[PDB]
């Protein structure tokens with residue numbers, strides 16, 4: 001997994017946002033960023049990777065109306081139920097960029 | 102907090118990625134996306150907002166060499182200490198776009 005530095009360049013960190021220019025699979029480049037605020041955490045002074053289970057335990061995501069995410073998710077008893085969350089709670093528009101605060 | 106809805110149009114979810122087109126602080130529009138793989142978590146069937154204390158508890162972030170992030174973070178005891186993590190463990194260049202996997 002990982003290894004972006006092998007095929008990307010001119011990276012920069014700004015607060016918690018990583019930005020870099022990376023080789024596409026066609027042969028040109030693209031510049032994107034990814035906010036690390038929700039990818040890593042601080043356990044007693046040490047940075048570590050924050051895991052999540054959305055992608056492995058939920059399926060069939062959909063946008064309901066303007067801002068509501070609907071999906072099906074596995075429960076402790078190992079079935080799938082329907083669940084919904086309002087993305088407006090914590091997803092903001094910060095100057096034309098979607099952010100999680 | 103959040104409320105991206107009120108100033109974005111054409112929002113879409115695909116997989117765990119949300120895309121929307123949002124207004125800039127003063128006209129102009131930008132389309133952008135955020136990968137919810139790391140912002141949401143399933144607890145017993147329900148989509149939950151995943152917290153991280155990185156922003157809240159660390160500072161002085163910095164890229165060192167080509168892939169290490171360095172920062173100082175508070176121990177549970179409230180002291181700052183420097184710490185570092187290799188972004189290459191899990192930051193990938195996926196066809197020109199940085200992803201956390």
Ligand SMILES: CCCCCO[C@@H]1O[C@H](CO)[C@@H](O)[C@H](O[C@H]2O[C@H](CO)[C@@H](O)[C@H](O)[C@@H]2O[C@H]2O[C@H](CO)[C@@H](O)[C@H](O)[C@@H]2O)[C@@H]1O
Nearest residue numbers: 092093094095096103104105106107108124125126127128
């Ligand atoms: C293009 C219309 C020009 C007039 C709008 O002016 C607003 O007034 C304030 C000055 O900054 C500010 O509240 C607004 O910034 C808000 O909305 C713009 C989008 O039009 C954003 O670019 C900016 O980040 C800020 O967004 C926040 O509030 C929004 C709800 O109104 C919400 O949609 C976002 O998630 C942010 O929380 C704007 O400049």
Ligand SMILES: CCCCCO[C@@H]1O[C@H](CO)[C@@H](O)[C@H](O[C@H]2O[C@H](CO)[C@@H](O)[C@H](O)[C@@H]2O[C@H]2O[C@H](CO)[C@@H](O)[C@H](O)[C@@H]2O)[C@@H]1O
Nearest residue numbers: 001002003004005006007023024025192193194195196197
């Ligand atoms: C002129 C010949 C190039 C033809 C394309 O094939 C390449 O070689 C491999 C095919 O088996 C393949 O691994 C390569 O893919 C990756 O690299 C490109 C950019 O070079 C990315 O766009 C793509 O997402 C994928 O990135 C991954 O590989 C890198 C390690 O090389 C790493 O830096 C990234 O983080 C990803 O792990 C290419 O298609």
Ligand SMILES: [Mg+2]
Nearest residue numbers: 038050139151
């Ligand atoms: Mg997270």
